[PDB]
Amino acid sequence: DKPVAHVVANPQAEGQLQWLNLLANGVELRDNQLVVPSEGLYLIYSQVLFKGQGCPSTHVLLTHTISRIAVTKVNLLSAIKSPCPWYEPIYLGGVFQLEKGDRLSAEINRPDYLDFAESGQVYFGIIAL
Amino acid sequence: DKPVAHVVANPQAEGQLQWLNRRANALLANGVELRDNQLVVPSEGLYLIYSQVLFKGQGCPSTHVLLTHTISRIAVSYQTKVNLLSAIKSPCQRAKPWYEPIYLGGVFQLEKGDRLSAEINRPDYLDFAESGQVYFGIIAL
Amino acid sequence: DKPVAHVVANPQAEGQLQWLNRRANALLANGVELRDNQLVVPSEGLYLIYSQVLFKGQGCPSTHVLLTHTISRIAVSYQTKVNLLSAIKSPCQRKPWYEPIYLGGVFQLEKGDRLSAEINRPDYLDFAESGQVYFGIIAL
Amino acid sequence: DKPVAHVVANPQAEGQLQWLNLLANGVELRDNQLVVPSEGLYLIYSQVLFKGQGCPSTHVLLTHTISRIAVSYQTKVNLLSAIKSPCPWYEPIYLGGVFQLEKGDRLSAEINRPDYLDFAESGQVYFGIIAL
Ligand SMILES: Cc1cc2occ(CN(C)CCN(C)Cc3cn(-c4cccc(C(F)(F)F)c4)c4ccccc34)c(=O)c2cc1C
Ligand SMILES: Cc1cc2occ(CN(C)CCN(C)Cc3cn(-c4cccc(C(F)(F)F)c4)c4ccccc34)c(=O)c2cc1C
């Protein structure tokens, strides 16, 4: 009965990383954000896949970050890659103490580079400890 | 009441990778302590241990840049520093900025009082400009 | 793609813990070998390693019975035997007793590493039925 | 896309360990058994919790085993087994390993003493597979 979530990205969304409604024991998906049903320790994780065709002239940075909106806002986890056909994953994860009704966003800078070749390989989840 | 920790690099500590718990969304719970820049395990057990360090440089002056990241254990009973996890990266094969995140994770039998270090060789390439980019944590299983 | 193994004790080997792949439902796939009673890793990587041993005795003649189970790694460039996982049990504090010992963890391994899973008391080993003593790895 | 299952025991079954109907990507539960939808390497795991009050004169042995029913090869063997001798006591038994399975193979997770099952914690008696 411990809160758990695992949302996957909508491949058919336009210029957005958008999460599709596992969402169990009180975790909600609202406003593209995971809402935590109770205070406690949560493992938070995500994976986004990026792909591109060759290397252009403007230098490509790929960013991915998980943020906590404490209903204050702050970056929990963030990573950046500089890919310059190329393929890059960015993973994030850790344990955090969260408050009831906190909201969690997992965001990127370049939705156009998203790689939906493998289904459900772009995800975001939490598991309460 | 599982021991758990998640510490983050100190963005005011130049030329060092210094871990902090006293930040919003860094964590020491249920007995894990941070002392002398090391996580101290409060009780014997199985622990998932993980880290991410973000390296960044401006251009490649040399092909010989080598970035290392390691997590090691020091046991009270066997004062030797023993590596648990390590990775090495060569970011420069040949002036725009390169980024190289290094991730370490594994599941280890740890003893009461073990000290866990997470270290790098090049704190001048460390990127803690934004929060969330350099971290080190453990979860008792 | 990933290297994987799951080996089981030889019920015909008395006084030892001898692993087998050549049984129905034991496995060596994608490069893992079993040689000199050890699993040999085919490539550098992160590996979940696990074992279960079932010990069984008939009564407690002594409170000093001690059961150990360990998994060790021998690296080509190191040659020192280094413990990855270990447990100890004292079954007799004072009829058959049973003590399953479970080991599990996730380790960085190199090409050619040799993994050993051993016990101190093969006379207490219970491989009467299948599935009771096993040792495996899964590349992650 | 990879087959996965995790079924939990029915706390209201009589004199039996009975799995309730995730169950995705082709895994089925049929005749109290998980059925594999494709050939491949599977992680198989389970946990059963037993509990009892004090220790009697009859010696309590608790067994738990996972079996592979190979349908076309027509044979049936234990994949994983363990035994505990508990003699208010509490005992878990875990099982797990990686196995190569064939399409339509059926998997059972069985015990010897359903009367000792401990349903005190709801989501703690379970049986699952994860295709690699
Ligand atoms: C902190 C961290 C350490 C890590 O260390 C090792 C690996 C390599 N692997 C375990 C297999 C390759 N992967 C991509 C798997 C993976 C591993 N983790 C992971 C591993 C350990 C600890 C955590 C955390 F959530 F607890 F912080 C996550 C993932 C989280 C999200 C998506 C994928 C993963 C990682 O991928 C990794 C990822 C992260 C985020
Ligand atoms: C082979 C084996 C090794 C093991 O080594 C370590 C532990 C100790 N722990 C991780 C404490 C937490 N547990 C009891 C949970 C647990 C750990 N495993 C587990 C761990 C490693 C490998 C596997 C396997 F599925 F790959 F075989 C299972 C479970 C399988 C089913 C139900 C529960 C578990 C185990 O419980 C364990 C269980 C098993 C079955």
XYZ file of C-alpha atoms and ligand atoms in Angstrom:
622
model
C 0.000 0.000 0.000
C 3.144 2.121 -0.370
C 2.827 4.789 -3.117
C 4.429 3.876 -6.435
C 4.398 5.409 -9.924
C 5.804 4.744 -13.356
C 4.693 7.042 -16.138
C 5.863 6.813 -19.782
C 6.149 9.637 -22.340
C 3.491 10.334 -24.955
C 5.299 9.847 -28.300
C 2.448 11.680 -30.051
C 2.737 14.934 -28.061
C 3.784 18.143 -29.849
C 6.981 19.917 -28.745
C 6.581 18.582 -25.190
C 7.757 15.855 -22.877
C 4.274 14.711 -21.756
C 3.601 11.867 -19.291
C 0.896 9.256 -19.942
C -1.310 7.834 -17.232
C 1.340 2.520 -13.187
C -0.030 5.115 -10.758
C -0.875 3.422 -7.481
C -1.634 3.866 -3.763
C -2.450 7.544 -3.998
C 0.105 8.867 -6.474
C -1.626 11.117 -9.018
C -0.513 12.525 -12.359
C -1.738 16.135 -12.599
C -0.430 19.028 -14.742
C 2.234 16.657 -16.178
C 3.583 16.227 -12.607
C 3.553 13.385 -10.083
C 1.749 14.294 -6.900
C 2.878 12.572 -3.713
C 0.029 11.279 -1.457
C 2.020 11.149 1.821
C 5.124 12.445 3.603
C 8.065 10.000 3.470
C 11.183 8.784 1.709
C 10.870 8.293 -2.013
C 13.179 6.873 -4.621
C 12.749 9.060 -7.697
C 13.991 8.037 -11.131
C 13.664 8.836 -14.823
C 15.144 8.003 -18.221
C 14.794 10.062 -21.390
C 16.307 8.950 -24.699
C 17.593 11.412 -27.296
C 18.615 10.715 -30.866
C 19.883 12.840 -33.751
C 21.064 12.565 -37.335
C 24.681 13.708 -37.715
C 26.128 16.861 -36.155
C 25.042 20.417 -37.105
C 26.684 23.858 -36.752
C 24.836 25.114 -33.672
C 26.202 23.119 -30.734
C 23.587 20.792 -29.218
C 23.158 20.561 -25.437
C 20.680 18.023 -24.044
C 19.426 18.683 -20.494
C 17.156 16.631 -18.282
C 16.016 17.549 -14.757
C 13.668 16.391 -12.023
C 12.216 19.202 -9.874
C 10.272 19.258 -6.632
C 7.506 21.787 -6.217
C 6.981 21.922 -2.484
C 3.395 23.171 -2.304
C 9.326 26.635 -3.013
C 10.760 24.949 -6.126
C 14.123 23.207 -6.560
C 16.102 20.899 -8.859
C 16.403 17.469 -7.283
C 18.373 15.758 -10.068
C 19.916 17.064 -13.254
C 22.275 15.973 -16.027
C 23.551 17.383 -19.301
C 25.000 15.739 -22.397
C 26.716 17.129 -25.487
C 26.239 14.557 -28.281
C 28.555 16.305 -30.780
C 23.604 9.286 -36.256
C 23.980 9.664 -32.455
C 22.085 8.185 -29.497
C 22.216 9.485 -25.905
C 20.407 8.399 -22.727
C 20.165 10.571 -19.653
C 19.288 8.857 -16.375
C 18.440 10.395 -13.023
C 17.796 8.882 -9.619
C 18.030 9.239 -5.892
C 16.303 9.088 -2.537
C 14.444 12.165 -1.240
C 12.290 13.059 1.744
C 9.045 14.419 0.308
C 5.997 16.108 1.841
C 2.333 15.273 1.233
C 1.021 16.958 -1.911
C 4.489 17.746 -3.252
C 4.573 17.683 -7.032
C 7.360 16.265 -9.137
C 8.288 17.305 -12.674
C 10.681 15.579 -15.051
C 11.575 17.915 -17.900
C 13.957 18.296 -20.877
C 15.193 21.186 -23.007
C 14.889 19.578 -26.445
C 11.656 17.592 -27.008
C 12.403 17.478 -30.756
C 15.401 15.198 -30.142
C 13.373 12.673 -28.121
C 13.753 9.070 -29.244
C 10.542 7.000 -29.287
C 12.036 4.117 -31.298
C 11.715 1.826 -28.260
C 8.336 2.123 -26.550
C 8.274 2.928 -22.817
C 12.037 3.561 -22.610
C 11.257 7.140 -21.721
C 9.859 7.121 -18.172
C 9.632 8.776 -14.772
C 8.695 7.117 -11.537
C 8.708 7.089 -7.755
C 8.643 4.302 -5.214
C 7.941 5.063 -1.548
C 10.318 3.433 0.909
C 13.509 2.699 9.773
C 16.053 2.047 6.982
C 19.331 3.964 6.889
C 19.374 6.192 3.832
C 21.455 9.131 2.596
C 21.680 11.454 -0.382
C 24.369 14.135 -0.348
C 25.235 16.796 -2.920
C 28.373 18.634 -3.862
C 29.101 22.024 -2.236
C 29.036 24.657 -5.044
C 31.095 27.029 -2.895
C 33.948 24.566 -2.454
C 36.309 25.184 -5.406
C 38.894 22.513 -6.321
C 37.129 20.053 -4.023
C 34.303 17.580 -4.208
C 32.798 18.280 -0.770
C 29.486 16.663 0.107
C 26.682 18.369 1.941
C 23.667 17.171 3.816
C 22.612 20.614 5.090
C 20.903 21.602 1.862
C 17.264 21.386 0.893
C 16.744 17.953 -0.632
C 19.965 16.419 0.622
C 19.319 13.733 3.181
C 20.800 11.868 6.141
C 18.233 9.577 7.781
C 18.039 6.804 10.392
C 21.648 6.795 11.469
C 23.747 7.567 8.391
C 26.182 10.365 9.249
C 28.459 12.499 7.112
C 31.896 13.006 8.661
C 35.187 14.002 7.074
C 33.413 14.035 3.672
C 32.432 10.335 3.996
C 29.114 8.582 4.604
C 29.263 6.527 7.817
C 27.023 3.500 7.929
C 25.190 3.047 11.232
C 24.591 -0.739 11.053
C 25.574 -3.881 9.124
C 23.469 -4.630 6.087
C 22.979 -4.712 2.348
C 23.122 -1.240 0.716
C 22.384 0.077 -2.730
C 25.070 2.749 -3.241
C 24.963 5.228 -6.127
C 26.441 8.464 -7.414
C 26.398 10.856 -10.350
C 29.080 13.432 -11.066
C 28.762 15.935 -13.887
C 31.957 16.924 -15.587
C 32.177 19.841 -17.989
C 35.005 21.436 -19.947
C 35.497 24.197 -22.502
C 37.181 22.619 -25.515
C 39.851 19.954 -25.836
C 43.368 21.389 -25.376
C 44.732 17.858 -25.122
C 43.542 14.335 -26.037
C 44.982 13.248 -22.652
C 42.190 14.532 -20.380
C 41.193 11.653 -18.087
C 38.210 11.858 -15.721
C 37.796 9.276 -12.959
C 35.081 8.722 -10.453
C 35.152 6.151 -7.647
C 33.246 5.010 -4.616
C 35.257 3.194 -1.988
C 34.742 1.641 1.401
C 36.874 1.858 4.531
C 36.046 -0.724 7.165
C 36.899 -0.162 10.846
C 38.393 -3.668 11.081
C 40.393 -3.535 7.845
C 41.630 0.039 7.446
C 42.464 -0.489 3.742
C 40.668 1.706 1.196
C 38.887 -0.685 -1.108
C 37.182 0.378 -4.307
C 33.564 -0.653 -4.724
C 32.808 1.149 -7.975
C 34.914 3.057 -10.490
C 34.686 4.548 -13.954
C 37.125 6.303 -16.235
C 36.285 8.640 -19.152
C 38.383 10.259 -21.880
C 36.142 13.211 -22.988
C 38.560 14.557 -25.624
C 39.223 12.533 -28.784
C 40.764 15.614 -30.457
C 36.079 25.514 -28.627
C 32.625 24.333 -27.500
C 31.752 22.800 -24.125
C 31.798 19.032 -23.553
C 29.798 17.323 -20.834
C 30.453 13.886 -19.313
C 28.163 12.610 -16.578
C 29.606 9.574 -14.754
C 27.166 7.256 -12.964
C 28.040 4.596 -10.388
C 25.658 2.155 -8.718
C 25.823 -1.256 -7.016
C 24.597 -3.286 -4.037
C 27.050 -4.060 -1.238
C 27.338 -5.865 2.079
C 28.483 -3.125 4.492
C 29.428 -3.218 8.182
C 28.625 -0.976 11.084
C 30.888 2.009 10.930
C 32.084 1.574 7.336
C 33.017 4.879 5.699
C 32.069 5.464 2.046
C 33.987 7.903 -0.094
C 32.921 9.175 -3.498
C 35.793 10.843 -5.249
C 36.956 12.343 -8.526
C 40.400 13.226 -9.972
C 39.474 16.559 -11.658
C 37.412 18.882 -9.438
C 38.243 21.699 -11.900
C 35.995 19.937 -14.467
C 33.252 19.428 -11.905
C 30.024 21.112 -12.872
C 27.852 22.145 -9.925
C 26.534 25.349 -11.568
C 23.002 24.046 -11.164
C 21.649 21.954 -8.307
C 21.106 18.229 -8.752
C 24.134 17.491 -10.940
C 26.590 15.957 -8.423
C 25.283 13.562 -5.805
C 26.126 10.445 -3.709
C 23.688 8.251 -1.797
C 22.950 4.937 -0.101
C 19.790 2.956 0.726
C 19.746 0.082 3.218
C 17.906 -2.886 1.726
C 22.480 -10.347 -25.329
C 23.467 -10.188 -21.669
C 25.680 -12.776 -19.989
C 23.696 -14.854 -17.492
C 24.213 -18.061 -15.518
C 22.367 -20.146 -12.957
C 24.120 -23.299 -11.727
C 23.049 -25.886 -9.184
C 24.749 -28.250 -6.805
C 25.648 -31.758 -7.975
C 23.585 -34.152 -5.810
C 26.046 -36.935 -6.638
C 29.070 -35.089 -5.269
C 29.471 -36.074 -1.584
C 31.588 -33.894 0.722
C 31.608 -31.020 -1.718
C 29.616 -28.239 -3.287
C 30.108 -28.828 -7.004
C 28.164 -26.650 -9.418
C 26.582 -27.912 -12.634
C 25.274 -26.309 -15.792
C 24.477 -29.629 -17.518
C 21.176 -30.088 -15.749
C 17.704 -29.269 -16.998
C 17.087 -25.734 -15.709
C 20.678 -24.778 -15.052
C 21.981 -22.168 -17.432
C 25.083 -20.730 -19.020
C 24.276 -18.212 -21.751
C 25.997 -15.451 -23.744
C 29.565 -16.220 -22.742
C 29.518 -17.174 -19.052
C 31.510 -20.380 -18.566
C 31.886 -22.711 -15.633
C 35.458 -23.865 -15.109
C 37.221 -25.286 -12.064
C 33.873 -24.957 -10.249
C 33.769 -21.165 -10.853
C 31.674 -18.906 -13.029
C 33.879 -17.048 -15.512
C 32.617 -13.677 -16.643
C 32.957 -13.097 -20.406
C 32.923 -9.261 -20.409
C 33.394 -6.203 -18.196
C 30.117 -5.003 -16.699
C 27.731 -4.645 -13.794
C 26.419 -7.998 -12.530
C 23.699 -8.965 -10.083
C 25.123 -12.030 -8.256
C 23.024 -14.289 -6.001
C 23.060 -17.725 -4.369
C 21.016 -19.882 -2.051
C 22.356 -22.805 -0.052
C 20.140 -25.094 2.006
C 21.759 -26.572 5.075
C 20.102 -29.399 6.990
C 21.137 -31.243 10.126
C 19.680 -33.998 12.291
C 19.684 -32.641 15.839
C 22.163 -30.476 17.718
C 25.125 -32.461 19.118
C 26.837 -29.156 19.878
C 26.088 -25.430 20.115
C 29.337 -24.814 18.206
C 28.026 -25.730 14.738
C 28.928 -22.863 12.394
C 27.708 -22.568 8.800
C 29.295 -20.206 6.330
C 28.479 -19.278 2.806
C 30.488 -16.903 0.644
C 30.788 -15.625 -2.880
C 34.259 -14.495 -3.916
C 35.820 -12.915 -6.965
C 39.243 -13.676 -8.429
C 40.430 -11.093 -10.947
C 43.002 -11.925 -13.593
C 45.187 -8.901 -12.752
C 44.922 -9.306 -8.977
C 44.872 -13.076 -8.306
C 43.937 -12.400 -4.644
C 40.628 -14.026 -3.629
C 38.322 -11.265 -2.482
C 34.997 -11.804 -0.774
C 31.980 -10.086 -2.275
C 29.283 -11.584 -0.076
C 29.300 -13.715 3.056
C 26.961 -14.946 5.756
C 27.404 -17.005 8.902
C 24.724 -18.976 10.806
C 24.760 -20.808 14.146
C 21.820 -23.313 13.764
C 22.146 -24.867 17.228
C 21.429 -22.679 20.234
C 21.021 -25.713 22.536
C 14.791 -33.156 15.394
C 15.903 -31.821 11.969
C 16.959 -28.184 11.581
C 17.022 -26.241 8.331
C 19.000 -23.086 7.497
C 18.773 -21.634 4.019
C 21.511 -19.014 3.462
C 20.869 -16.380 0.792
C 23.462 -14.050 -0.789
C 22.746 -11.273 -3.277
C 24.428 -8.078 -4.457
C 25.414 -6.086 -7.552
C 29.093 -5.759 -8.477
C 31.445 -4.335 -11.113
C 33.216 -7.239 -12.712
C 35.920 -7.513 -15.371
C 36.471 -9.807 -18.281
C 37.820 -13.106 -16.976
C 36.850 -12.650 -13.336
C 36.212 -15.985 -11.627
C 33.298 -16.201 -9.174
C 33.317 -18.811 -6.426
C 30.382 -19.746 -4.205
C 31.502 -21.860 -1.279
C 30.430 -23.234 2.081
C 32.369 -24.633 5.092
C 30.125 -27.677 5.862
C 29.220 -29.765 2.764
C 28.099 -32.510 5.153
C 25.157 -30.253 6.131
C 24.337 -29.492 2.499
C 20.806 -30.443 1.527
C 20.553 -31.132 -2.191
C 18.086 -34.057 -1.712
C 15.486 -32.269 -3.824
C 16.261 -30.076 -6.829
C 16.247 -26.255 -6.605
C 17.663 -26.027 -3.083
C 21.279 -24.999 -3.836
C 22.052 -22.564 -6.614
C 24.391 -19.782 -7.759
C 23.841 -17.263 -10.560
C 24.772 -13.958 -12.182
C 22.925 -11.558 -14.479
C 24.688 -8.870 -16.454
C 22.928 -5.556 -16.079
C 7.264 -5.152 -24.615
C 8.819 -7.843 -22.406
C 6.535 -10.253 -20.478
C 6.153 -9.540 -16.769
C 3.959 -10.796 -13.935
C 3.532 -10.296 -10.225
C 0.611 -12.082 -8.652
C -0.295 -11.966 -4.946
C -1.952 -14.614 -2.778
C -5.676 -14.581 -1.976
C -6.056 -13.944 1.779
C -9.514 -15.613 1.650
C -8.664 -18.963 0.002
C -9.348 -22.197 1.939
C -6.486 -24.647 2.576
C -4.539 -23.466 -0.465
C -2.038 -20.933 -1.748
C -4.011 -19.162 -4.504
C -2.698 -16.374 -6.766
C -4.937 -13.366 -7.509
C -5.079 -11.738 -10.940
C 0.713 -6.956 -12.868
C 0.015 -9.512 -15.600
C 1.235 -7.982 -18.844
C 2.728 -8.434 -22.314
C 1.311 -11.924 -22.671
C 1.762 -13.539 -19.265
C -1.396 -15.437 -18.202
C -2.539 -16.939 -14.888
C -4.217 -20.285 -15.554
C -4.900 -23.179 -13.128
C -2.968 -21.269 -10.393
C 0.104 -21.124 -12.674
C 1.913 -18.433 -14.644
C 2.073 -19.189 -18.345
C 4.969 -17.845 -20.384
C 4.018 -16.241 -23.747
C 7.439 -16.566 -25.421
C 10.764 -18.383 -25.332
C 13.464 -16.507 -23.418
C 15.376 -15.860 -20.220
C 13.154 -15.127 -17.259
C 13.892 -13.925 -13.766
C 11.537 -15.889 -11.510
C 10.879 -14.909 -7.906
C 8.529 -15.418 -5.011
C 8.049 -14.758 -1.328
C 5.740 -16.532 1.112
C 5.322 -15.468 4.753
C 4.530 -18.068 7.433
C 3.563 -17.464 11.047
C 2.519 -19.502 14.070
C 1.822 -19.200 17.780
C 4.274 -21.054 20.027
C 5.784 -24.449 19.221
C 3.865 -27.777 19.332
C 4.883 -31.433 19.822
C 4.672 -32.239 16.101
C 7.750 -30.820 14.355
C 6.790 -28.055 11.889
C 8.499 -28.167 8.479
C 7.649 -25.310 6.081
C 8.444 -25.872 2.377
C 8.146 -23.561 -0.630
C 8.951 -24.459 -4.253
C 8.622 -23.070 -7.755
C 8.094 -25.659 -10.506
C 8.367 -25.551 -14.277
C 5.668 -27.348 -16.184
C 7.170 -27.783 -19.616
C 4.025 -28.491 -21.623
C 5.400 -29.868 -24.916
C 8.444 -31.585 -23.367
C 5.864 -33.201 -21.007
C 8.142 -33.226 -17.918
C 7.956 -31.244 -14.641
C 10.868 -30.259 -12.363
C 11.561 -28.024 -9.345
C 13.296 -24.820 -10.357
C 13.721 -23.407 -6.853
C 13.047 -24.818 -3.404
C 13.655 -24.036 0.281
C 12.640 -25.343 3.677
C 12.458 -23.846 7.144
C 12.026 -25.326 10.598
C 10.516 -22.558 12.719
C 10.767 -24.550 15.964
C 4.876 -16.226 18.302
C 7.204 -17.074 15.376
C 7.532 -15.539 11.907
C 9.349 -17.012 8.892
C 9.704 -15.881 5.278
C 10.868 -18.081 2.427
C 12.251 -16.364 -0.722
C 13.095 -17.992 -4.061
C 14.723 -16.564 -7.147
C 16.866 -17.173 -10.167
C 17.226 -16.850 -13.917
C 15.820 -19.551 -16.177
C 15.455 -20.224 -19.891
C 11.802 -21.003 -20.594
C 9.869 -22.144 -23.667
C 6.623 -20.718 -25.036
C 3.617 -22.012 -23.132
C 5.665 -23.215 -20.137
C 3.661 -23.021 -16.937
C 5.070 -22.039 -13.579
C 3.775 -22.935 -10.128
C 4.702 -21.576 -6.721
C 3.534 -23.986 -4.022
C 3.846 -24.528 -0.249
C 3.127 -27.471 2.064
C 1.329 -25.678 4.917
C -1.250 -23.080 3.728
C -2.678 -22.947 7.275
C 0.518 -21.226 8.439
C 0.326 -18.509 5.776
C 0.701 -15.012 7.177
C -1.621 -12.474 5.532
C -0.993 -9.813 8.223
C 0.832 -7.647 5.672
C -1.329 -7.534 2.533
C 1.181 -7.233 -0.340
C 3.848 -9.668 0.919
C 2.963 -13.127 -0.394
C 3.799 -12.994 -4.110
C 5.124 -14.794 -7.169
C 6.465 -13.131 -10.273
C 8.464 -13.339 -13.482
C 10.386 -10.774 -15.522
C 11.526 -11.625 -19.059
C 15.068 -10.399 -19.702
C 22.601 7.585 -9.851
C 22.653 6.551 -10.954
C 23.640 5.575 -10.878
C 23.731 4.608 -11.885
O 24.701 3.646 -11.833
C 24.639 2.505 -12.745
C 23.869 2.548 -13.854
C 24.007 1.443 -14.886
N 22.928 0.470 -14.702
C 22.469 0.064 -13.374
C 22.239 -0.143 -15.843
C 21.953 0.934 -16.890
N 20.774 1.724 -16.519
C 20.427 2.844 -17.364
C 19.918 1.365 -15.407
C 19.534 2.303 -14.265
C 20.024 2.296 -12.946
N 19.361 3.238 -12.228
C 19.641 3.484 -10.918
C 20.655 2.769 -10.288
C 21.028 2.927 -8.956
C 20.386 3.859 -8.157
C 19.373 4.621 -8.713
C 18.654 5.575 -7.798
F 17.411 5.746 -8.238
F 18.479 4.938 -6.655
F 19.285 6.678 -7.498
C 19.012 4.419 -10.055
C 18.440 3.866 -12.977
C 17.468 4.917 -12.828
C 16.664 5.295 -13.918
C 16.772 4.675 -15.172
C 17.716 3.661 -15.353
C 18.534 3.271 -14.229
C 22.990 3.555 -14.023
O 22.292 3.625 -15.028
C 22.861 4.622 -12.969
C 21.863 5.591 -13.044
C 21.762 6.555 -12.041
C 20.674 7.591 -12.163
C 18.718 -16.052 -4.381
C 18.347 -15.027 -3.339
C 19.387 -14.267 -2.828
C 19.116 -13.298 -1.874
O 20.130 -12.546 -1.355
C 19.820 -11.366 -0.580
C 18.616 -11.281 0.008
C 18.462 -10.261 1.103
N 17.673 -9.135 0.680
C 17.829 -8.527 -0.638
C 16.747 -8.637 1.691
C 15.422 -8.291 1.032
N 14.745 -9.496 0.573
C 14.449 -10.643 1.412
C 14.199 -9.435 -0.749
C 14.596 -10.238 -1.965
C 15.765 -10.279 -2.746
N 15.518 -11.110 -3.791
C 16.440 -11.430 -4.734
C 17.744 -10.922 -4.689
C 18.724 -11.205 -5.637
C 18.447 -12.045 -6.703
C 17.178 -12.595 -6.807
C 16.850 -13.458 -8.004
F 15.567 -13.242 -8.319
F 17.498 -12.960 -9.047
F 17.173 -14.725 -7.900
C 16.216 -12.267 -5.849
C 14.265 -11.593 -3.768
C 13.426 -12.486 -4.534
C 12.099 -12.722 -4.130
C 11.552 -12.126 -2.989
C 12.342 -11.271 -2.219
C 13.698 -11.028 -2.649
C 17.596 -12.070 -0.369
O 16.502 -12.031 0.175
C 17.823 -13.096 -1.433
C 16.778 -13.866 -1.927
C 17.036 -14.818 -2.897
C 15.864 -15.624 -3.418
